[PDB]
Amino acid sequence: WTATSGSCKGRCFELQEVGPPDCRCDNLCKSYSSCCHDFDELCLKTARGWECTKDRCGEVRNEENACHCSEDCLSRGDCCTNYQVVCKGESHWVDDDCEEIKVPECPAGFVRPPLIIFSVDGFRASYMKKGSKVMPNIEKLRSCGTHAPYMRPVYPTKTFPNLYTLATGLYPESHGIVGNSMYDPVFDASFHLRGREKFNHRWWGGQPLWITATKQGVRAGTFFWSVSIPHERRILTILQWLSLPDNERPSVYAFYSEQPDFSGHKYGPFGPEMTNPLREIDKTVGQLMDGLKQLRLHRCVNVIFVGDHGMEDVTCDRTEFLSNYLTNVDDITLVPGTLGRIRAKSINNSKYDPKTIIAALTCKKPDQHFKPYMKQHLPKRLHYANNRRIEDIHLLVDRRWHVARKPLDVYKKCFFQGDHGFDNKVNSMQTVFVGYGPTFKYRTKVPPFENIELYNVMCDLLGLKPAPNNGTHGSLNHLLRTNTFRPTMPDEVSRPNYPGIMYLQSEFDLGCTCDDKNKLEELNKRLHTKGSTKERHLLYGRPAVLYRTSYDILYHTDFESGYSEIFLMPLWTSYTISKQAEVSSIPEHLTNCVRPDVRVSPGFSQNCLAYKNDKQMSYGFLFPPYLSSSPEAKYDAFLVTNMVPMYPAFKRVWAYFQRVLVKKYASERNGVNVISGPIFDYNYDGLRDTEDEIKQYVEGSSIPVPTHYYSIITSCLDFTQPADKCDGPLSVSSFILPHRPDNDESCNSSEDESKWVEELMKMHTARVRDIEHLTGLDFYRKTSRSYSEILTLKTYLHTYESEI
Numbered sequence: 001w002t003a004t005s006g007s008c009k010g011r012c013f014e015l016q017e018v019g020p021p022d023c024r025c026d027n028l029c030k031s032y033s034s035c036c037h038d039f040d041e042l043c044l045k046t047a048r049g050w051e052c053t054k055d056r057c058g059e060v061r062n063e064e065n066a067c068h069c070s071e072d073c074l075s076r077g078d079c080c081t082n083y084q085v086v087c088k089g090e091s092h093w094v095d096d097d098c099e100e101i102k103v104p105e106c107p108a109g110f111v112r113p114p115l116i117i118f119s120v121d122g123f124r125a126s127y128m129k130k131g132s133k134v135m136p137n138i139e140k141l142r143s144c145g146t147h148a149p150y151m152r153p154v155y156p157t158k159t160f161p162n163l164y165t166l167a168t169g170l171y172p173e174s175h176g177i178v179g180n181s182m183y184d185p186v187f188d189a190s191f192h193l194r195g196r197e198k199f200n201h202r203w204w205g206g207q208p209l210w211i212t213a214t215k216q217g218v219r220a221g222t223f224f225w226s227v228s229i230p231h232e233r234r235i236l237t238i239l240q241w242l243s244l245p246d247n248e249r250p251s252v253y254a255f256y257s258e259q260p261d262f263s264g265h266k267y268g269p270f271g272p273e274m275t276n277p278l279r280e281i282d283k284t285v286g287q288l289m290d291g292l293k294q295l296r297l298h299r300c301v302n303v304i305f306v307g308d309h310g311m312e313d314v315t316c317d318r319t320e321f322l323s324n325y326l327t328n329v330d331d332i333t334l335v336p337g338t339l340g341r342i343r344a345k346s347i348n349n350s351k352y353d354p355k356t357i358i359a360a361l362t363c364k365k366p367d368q369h370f371k372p373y374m375k376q377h378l379p380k381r382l383h384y385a386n387n388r389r390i391e392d393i394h395l396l397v398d399r400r401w402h403v404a405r406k407p408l409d410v411y412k413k414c415f416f417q418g419d420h421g422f423d424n425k426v427n428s429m430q431t432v433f434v435g436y437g438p439t440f441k442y443r444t445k446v447p448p449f450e451n452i453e454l455y456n457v458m459c460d461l462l463g464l465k466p467a468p469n470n471g472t473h474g475s476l477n478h479l480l481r482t483n484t485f486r487p488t489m490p491d492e493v494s495r496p497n498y499p500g501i502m503y504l505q506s507e508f509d510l511g512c513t514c515d516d517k518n519k520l521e522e523l524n525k526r527l528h529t530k531g532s533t534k535e536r537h538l539l540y541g542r543p544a545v546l547y548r549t550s551y552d553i554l555y556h557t558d559f560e561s562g563y564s565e566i567f568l569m570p571l572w573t574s575y576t577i578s579k580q581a582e583v584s585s586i587p588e589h590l591t592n593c594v595r596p597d598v599r600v601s602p603g604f605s606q607n608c609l610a611y612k613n614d615k616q617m618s619y620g621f622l623f624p625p626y627l628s629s630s631p632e633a634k635y636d637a638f639l640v641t642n643m644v645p646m647y648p649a650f651k652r653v654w655a656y657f658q659r660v661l662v663k664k665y666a667s668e669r670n671g672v673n674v675i676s677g678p679i680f681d682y683n684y685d686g687l688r689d690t691e692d693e694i695k696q697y698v699e700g701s702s703i704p705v706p707t708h709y710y711s712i713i714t715s716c717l718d719f720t721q722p723a724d725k726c727d728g729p730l731s732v733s734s735f736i737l738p739h740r741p742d743n744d745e746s747c748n749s750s751e752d753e754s755k756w757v758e759e760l761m762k763m764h765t766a767r768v769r770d771i772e773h774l775t776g777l778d779f780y781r782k783t784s785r786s787y788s789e790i791l792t793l794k795t796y797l798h799t800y801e802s803e804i
């Protein structure tokens with residue numbers, strides 16, 4: 001109950017929310033149904049429209065007008081945005097040549113350039129090119145400021161997860177807003193688009209930008225707007241706030257547009273009805289910029305034009321129904337649409353089994369348009385598991401499709417031609433970024449980047465220290481003219497041992513066998529074991545270990561490794577494969593060869609007997625024998641310290657990568673440097689497991705089984721230079737392959753690895769940064785590149801999509 005008895009007199013769009021029981025006058029009161037009786041009358045004035053006309057010029061003030069064209073309007077801060085153009089001979093901002101903004105040109109009393117975030121819902125990245133003719137204000141921002149060809153949203157590519165990621169720098173799994181619709185089993189409460197539960201603070205984790213600003217003494221405009229407040233009034237309100245006295249005026253503001261998303265759902269992303277919403281958005285940007293110009297703020301304010309996600313073509317007829325797959329369809333609850341999330345309809349149903357639901361959903365139809373996963377098996381790049389609000393069973397839905405429980409849900413709940421929510425590497429889901437202002441660079445294009453990085457930059461723009469978040473601070477320094485953030489590399493926590501030959505063959509009782517059999521060549525092999533070729537295979541310095549552990553550096557002719565005495569295998573193995581390198585086979589006599597490593601105690605070694613006994617588990621090697629530089633160097637690849645546990649199903653994947661793909665990349669990229677290793681993430685939190693988190697060992701041993709295997713493949717960005725003699729920027733692609741005992745994820749896996757392995761790898765593409773979180777390692781410590789450029793390289797994701 002609200003005491004709507006109060007008045008909004010002089011409180012219109014009040015910045016601090018008034019305490020109950022009082023009627024509210026803030027931009028969100030509509031949505032709470034708590035506005036004062038006179039809110040519409042005093043605060044949502046419409047009389048006379050939004051534009052000055054020649055006859056209105058120098059009129060006597062009439063407080064009933066929506067905006068004013070009287071002489072005092074500028075100093076009152078409430079002129080219509082076209083006032084100086086219609087009445088004072090000025091030009092519209094869009095008609096002015098752009099001029100570099102080298103420094104902020106702010107009125108006296110501004111302690112920092114204000115930040116305005118202009119967010120546009122559903123603004124697909126290709127709209128910038130495809131709509132350019134009808135968006136002249138936006139086009140000017142884009143070509144005069146700093147822009148990316150596109151910006152990557154987070155998964156799922158839905159409205160609330162992405163707006164709140166923009167605000168916090170966090171993945172949905174960490175901020176807690178994991179969909180537009182959610183059930184939290186601890187609260188036993190549901191979050192919906194319609195309704196009041198979504199206003200409860202307990203849903204909203206991390207620390208959004210407005211809160212970060214407030215805590216550090218920077219005042220914020222209210223970011224959220226009731227849908228019924230027209231866009232023109234939102235713009236007028238921000239401009240009015242910008243006229244407040246120095247002590248009252250906010251430094252950060254947000255405008256939000258429900259368009260083009262609203263129309264995109266109805267008409268599809270490129271429907272002919274889409275031109276008008278785009279024109280109208282541009283007109284709004286033009287009113288803002290004209291309005292800033294009148295206030296002498298157009299060369300003072302930093303403006304971010306940013307979308308939350310794109311929009312894809314999706315229609316009723318492209319719906320998969322779980323009732324075609326599951327006999328037990330009424331025993332599940334599905335969160336439906338462009339993603340699926342499944343849980344038991346009732347917690348009292350003891351006959352509910354996720355394994356049988358998964359199996360009934362797996363590769364059941366030739367062109368099946370969704371794929372089931374236990375959430376811990378989703379591509380790690382999605383970071384979509386570590387939240388109790390994310391159901392154990394997930395359906396990744398093909399672009400252009402929906403999943404639903406039963407046909408009745410679709411025709412009794414066609415209409416829409418667009419939707420979003422799909423995998424965040426999908427081109428149609430990409431959105432936009434443009435930065436314009438004194439702190440952004442001039443006429444500069446930057447590579448695509450992820451929206452999780454923006455919170456840091458917005459903090460930088462406002463001189464704030466960001467709360468802990470998933471961005472990599474410094475990775476977007478190249479967007480900025482100043483206010484860059486200069487981080488230091490993390491300090492290495494553990495130093496390696498460099499073991500020499502310390503054990504005799506006979507001290508090893510590992511159940512291992514190998515058919516293995518001159519001072520010129522013997523001085524040579526000794527030099528290689530001391531690191532003589534390390535400069536060839538360790539191109540960017542050794543990775544630093546950022547946690548407390550015990551490990552050894554092991555040198556070889558063809559590869560170098562950091563070998564964990566705790567996990568009994570390498571944390572990392574590093575090797576370089578030149579364009580000229582030749583692939584060989586494992587000679588027949590060496591087929592089951594495993595050799596003790598005389599530098600490493602039996603007590604810190606794997607053993608072959610454990611693999612023999614473990615009927616499910618086999619082994620592979622991190623440096624592949626196929627790539628050995630000579631028959632003699634090949635023996636190094638069979639060392640027990642190069643061995644890792646591998647399910648035979650995974651060996652199919654791993655063998656193809658090592659035998660076929662590495663050489664292919666080396667030929668295509670002019671040499672590659674490869675770092676591979678294991679990953680343990682049994683609690684699916686995207687972070688390196690400690691030894692006590694390991695859920696699976698090779699039977700009868702203390703050899704921990706990895707959940708994933710990574711590789712990082714680096715070469716020269718200028719591919720006319722070979723990877724090992726590169727003078728400038730680097731180029732990287734990486735992956736985090738799930739280590740699974742079956743290939744159920746690949747519906748074509750009965751076929752030859754040339755028909756399905758590369759597709760699996762593409763799906764499990766990763767950023768180096770993802771691997772760093774998962775391993776506690778820090779890569780690229782010794783390059784001739786600036787650290788910020790390396791941070792950018794570490795956040796790179798090779799997506800394998802075609803051109804935007």
Ligand SMILES: *[C@@H]1O[C@H](CO)[C@@H](O[C@@H]2O[C@H](CO)[C@@H](O[C@@H]3O[C@H](CO[C@H]4O[C@H](CO)[C@@H](O)[C@H](O[C@H]5O[C@H](CO)[C@@H](O)[C@H](O)[C@@H]5O[C@H]5O[C@H](CO)[C@@H](O)[C@H](O)[C@@H]5O)[C@@H]4O)[C@@H](O)[C@H](O[C@H]4O[C@H](CO)[C@@H](O)[C@H](O)[C@@H]4O[C@H]4O[C@H](CO)[C@@H](O)[C@H](O)[C@@H]4O)[C@@H]3O)[C@H](O)[C@H]2NC(C)=O)[C@H](O)[C@H]1NC(C)=O
Pocket residue numbers: 170171173174175176202203204205206383386387388468469470685686687773
């Ligand atoms: C992306 O960036 C983010 C932010 O940096 C990274 O997330 C951080 O990860 C940290 C390491 O896991 C984590 O630190 C833990 O914090 C615990 C205290 O947390 C509360 O306070 C903070 C600060 O205000 C707050 O942010 C937290 O908010 C979480 O929880 C609330 C309520 O549930 C949510 O609203 C909110 O969305 C957020 O949830 C997310 O994180 C939690 C984990 O905290 C998940 O469970 C959720 O699913 C969701 O993802 C909290 O309000 C602190 O208690 C922890 O300490 C325990 O463990 C350490 C191990 O080092 C040990 O030293 C301690 O003794 C303690 O152990 C005891 O508790 C254990 C668990 O109950 C128990 O098993 C033991 O036996 C002991 O009794 C821990 O330090 C930090 O909270 C989050 N922050 C956020 C915002 O998510 C994230 O990792 C990055 N992602 C990647 C891939 O890099």
Ligand SMILES: O=C(c1ccc2[nH]nnc2c1)N1C[C@@H]2[C@H](C1)[C@H]1CN(C(=O)c3cc4ccccc4c(OCC(F)(F)F)n3)C[C@@H]21
Pocket residue numbers: 117119121159160161162163164165166167180193223224225226254255256261
């Ligand atoms: O019902 C929907 C909706 C919209 C499009 C849909 N497509 N498919 N389903 C949909 C459902 N809503 C309506 C609400 C919310 C999404 C949008 C955020 N809003 C801000 O003023 C606003 C503006 C912001 C501007 C910058 C940063 C954050 C902002 C923020 O934050 C919202 C959050 F905090 F909850 F994340 N809110 C109002 C709009």
Ligand SMILES: [Ca+2]
Pocket residue numbers: 611612613614615616617618
């Ligand atoms: Ca075995």
Ligand SMILES: [Ca+2]
Pocket residue numbers: 680681682683684685686687688689
């Ligand atoms: Ca973990």
Ligand SMILES: [Cl-]
Pocket residue numbers: 156158178179180181335
């Ligand atoms: Cl959702």
Ligand code: NA
Pocket residue numbers: 743744745746747748749750
């Ligand atoms: Na298969």
Ligand SMILES: [Zn+2]
Pocket residue numbers: 122159261262265420
């Ligand atoms: Zn939408």
